[PDB]
Ligand binder design. Structure first.
Ligand SMILES: O=C(O)c1cc2cc(Cl)sc2[nH]1
Ligand SMILES: [Mg+2]
Ligand SMILES: [Mg+2]
Ligand SMILES: [Mg+2]
Length: 715
């Protein structure tokens, strides 16, 4: 065929081989029984999966027709959504009962990294990013300005280094204050009677709160490092007077190390391009290596844990790696990794649950067959499930997980669930969605891109929508952000599960990140997404300056969003825009699509630093495609713009995207032979067919074009 027959299934040999030879050994699950369970799970769960997808289509069909007869009566609109089953009754108050959850999630607040699992070295970097140098972060980025004269160059600018040092000293004052004086005047550190004691030029002092002293290394009389704790996060003062930086430091300090990326999401969904059996296996194989703890790539090796000395005691170890979640794909797509007897593809999410769940077994244990490094410490498996619509699709995820756990021979509720709030039918039924996963949920979060794509698609027929930039401050999205935090805290998330907020996408603009991203913890988010290990470290500053626990209890019991605000469709007003503004918005959207699409389709890259139309480096996932294509399809549908406008724009934008990828040998230009670039045709189709797509999802077209490209590369 060539495939492996097991019941109604025809399994791609690469997958069959990978599973039996690499993933199964060490798990004590008998191969023939694993494959029987797979057959059974797929046979039993496929019908309901399909039933859900159909229900999505029926609802959207009803809304499309409703809008085609029309301001908007919100009373009648709201009651329509209730009649059809879109808006469901808000259940009574409850508290989640999820148990066996790691410390990283229950108690601590901090940055959360996301990385495409298909890139080993990015995945490895993310795992080791649990601890990072603040000096390197401050020195290498624009947090410390190049004026003056702190300009960066080949040589080490000693002027810049002093700025870094002073910056770090201040942070210490702010986060672990001394009873008198400041770290900036320190001459040394000693450990007397299980207390940190700091040497001043005048006298000496202790911590204003001695309980913030976590541990140390070396002799108590002359420590090689000091370990501090604040708001659950650790701070390490590396002390070494013989160091280059140390010789010039008043107290011999070499560096300050911050606990940064507390948890990481290894991503199988929107940051990766994976359209067939071969791609899935490359992804499963890295997930395997991460869980074994033996993954290593050729630039290297997962960092082992960090050992310290307790204040008045023996040794203790702290986790050196970021706690790994995995984002499986959602309920939509199928993949040829497995087909049935009639040749139709199996649902890709069901597959991920089985395989990523199986592979995750190796991370619950350290052995010669399971590999040396453990992930979860409380025996959990953390799966973020994206793009769910409403509480019934959450319950289906519960059931899927529950069924997988039987096949894997795991205790029930082993497989925990991160509910991404990124679709409108979830937003407005959020409390119900959490309720359906009440014994499994460990995470909710919000974002911009997917949610705004769905916003636009759901109300496609209602009229033209505001510009993408404008969306970020519209009533619905402000309500959506608050209503998430509120639903969460009301379900008892504080001290139990993460409340997360979106990615900082501008990877070179770190000064701005430090200035503004502090808004997310101030809004009571226990975690938020960062695009790099450097960003994780800088964002960790915010959890020191903000007591997320304190903020969360202050927000307790508040109902800051109304259903009316959630349901306020972002229609543009009359007149609204001038020609030049319209063209500018089209260009920006065609550049966004083209810029991301060309690397996805031509090179199978789903996450990278893509310069936007103003050459700013952005790190967005595939959901950039959905928001951009839906906005244009919306503008197209209501005659704000034409198909020829869109094509003229794609043709204008293409050569810029081309020259923006000049430093690439494997890059192939889209201009001037437009109609012969699979990437180009993919970008054009995403728009002109955008309105027909199920909920505006881009994967159907995208996967097919990537398949088409790989097929032409087979000759
Ligand atoms: O929501 C976003 O903008 C966003 C998500 C992800 C995942 C990555 Cl890996 S990079 C990235 N950006
Ligand atoms: Mg998304
Ligand atoms: Mg405090
Ligand atoms: Mg439709």
């Amino acid at each position: 065929t060539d495939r492996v027959s097991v019941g109604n299934l025809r399994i791609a040999r690469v997958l069959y081989d990978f599973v039996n030879n690499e993933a199964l050994p060490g798990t004590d699950i008998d191969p023939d029984s694993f494959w029987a369970g797979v057959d059974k799970v797929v046979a039993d769960l496929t019908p309901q999966n399909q039933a859900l997808l159909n229900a999505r289509d029926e609802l959207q069909a009803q809304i499309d027709k409703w809008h085609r007869r029309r301001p908007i009566d919100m009373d009648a609109y709201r009651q329509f959504l209730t009649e059809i089953g879109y808006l469901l009754p808000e259940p009574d108050d409850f508290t989640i009962t999820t148990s066996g959850v790691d410390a990283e999630i229950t108690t601590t607040a901090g940055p959360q990294l996301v990385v495409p699992v298909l890139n080993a070295r990015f995945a490895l970097n993310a795992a080791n990013a649990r601890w990072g140098s603040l000096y390197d972060a401050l020195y290498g980025t624009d947090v410390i300005p190049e004026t003056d004269g702190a300009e960066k160059g080949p040589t080490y600018n000693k002027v810049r280094g002093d700025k870094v040092i002073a910056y770090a000293r201040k942070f210490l004052d702010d986060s672990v204050p001394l009873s008198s004086g400041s770290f900036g005047d320190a001459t040394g550190f000693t450990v007397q009677d299980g207390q940190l004691v700091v040497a001043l030029p005048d006298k000496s002092t202790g911590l204003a709160n001695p309980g913030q002293f976590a541990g140390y290394t070396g002799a108590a009389e002359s420590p090689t490092s000091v370990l501090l704790i604040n708001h659950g996060l650790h701070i390490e003062i590396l002390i070494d007077p013989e160091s280059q930086v140390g010789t010039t430091d008043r107290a011999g300090v070499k560096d300050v190390i911050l606990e940064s990326a507390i948890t990481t999401i290894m991503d199988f969904e929107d940051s990766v391009a994976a359209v067939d059996a071969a791609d899935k296996v490359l992804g499963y194989r890295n997930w395997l290596g991460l869980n074994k703890g033996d993954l290593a790539a050729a630039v290297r090796v997962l960092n082992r844990d960090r050992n310290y000395t307790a204040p008045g005691g023996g040794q203790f170890t702290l986790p050196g790696r970021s706690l790994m979640f995995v984002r499986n794909v959602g309920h939509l797509m199928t993949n040829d990794a497995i087909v049935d007897t009639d040749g139709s593809e199996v649902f890709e999410g069901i597959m991920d649950a089985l395989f990523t769940g199986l592979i995750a077994i190796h991370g619950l244990k350290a052995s010669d067959v399971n590999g040396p490094l453990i992930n979860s410490r409380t025996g959990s498996i953390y799966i973020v499930k994206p793009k769910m619509h409403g509480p019934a699709e959450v319950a289906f995820t519960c059931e899927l997980f529950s069924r997988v756990e039987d096949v894997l021979g795991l205790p029930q509720n082993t497989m925990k669930i991160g509910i991404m709030d990124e679709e409108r039918r979830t937003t407005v039924n959020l409390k119900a969605c959490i309720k359906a996963a009440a014994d499994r949920v460990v995470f909710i979060n919000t974002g911009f891109l997917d949610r705004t794509g769905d916003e636009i698609h759901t109300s496609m027929e209602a009229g033209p929508m505001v510009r993408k930039g404008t969306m970020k401050s519209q009533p619905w999205i402000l309500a959506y952000e608050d209503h998430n935090v509120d639903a969460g805290l009301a379900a008892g998330f504080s001290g139990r599960a993460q409340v997360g907020k979106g990615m900082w996408t501008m990877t070179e603009l770190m000064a701005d990140m430090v200035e503004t991203k502090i808004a997310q913890p101030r809004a009571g988010a226990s975690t938020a997404w960062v695009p790099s290990p450097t960003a994780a470290t800088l964002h960790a500053l915010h959890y020191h300056q903000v007591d997320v626990a304190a903020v969360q209890q202050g927000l307790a019991g508040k109902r800051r969003a109304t259903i009316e605000q959630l349901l306020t469709i972002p229609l543009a007003k009359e007149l609204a825009w001038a020609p030049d503004e319209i063209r500018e918005e089209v260009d920006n959207n065609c550049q966004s699509i083209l810029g991301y699409v060309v690397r996805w389709v031509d090179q199978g890259v789903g996450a990278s630093k893509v310069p936007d139309i103003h050459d700013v480096a952005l790190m967005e996932d595939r959901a950039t495609l959905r928001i951009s294509s839906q906005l244009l399809a919306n503008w197209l549908r209501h005659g704000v713009i034409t198909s020829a406008d869109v094509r003229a724009s794609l043709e204008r934008m293409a050569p810029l995207v081309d020259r923006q990828n000049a430093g690439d040998v494997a890059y192939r230009p889209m201009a001037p032979n437009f109609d012969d670039s699979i990437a180009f045709l993919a970008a054009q189709e995403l728009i002109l067919s955008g309105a027909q797509q199920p909920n505006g999802y881009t994967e159907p077209i995208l996967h097919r074009r990537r398949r088409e490209f790989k097929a032409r590369a087979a000759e």
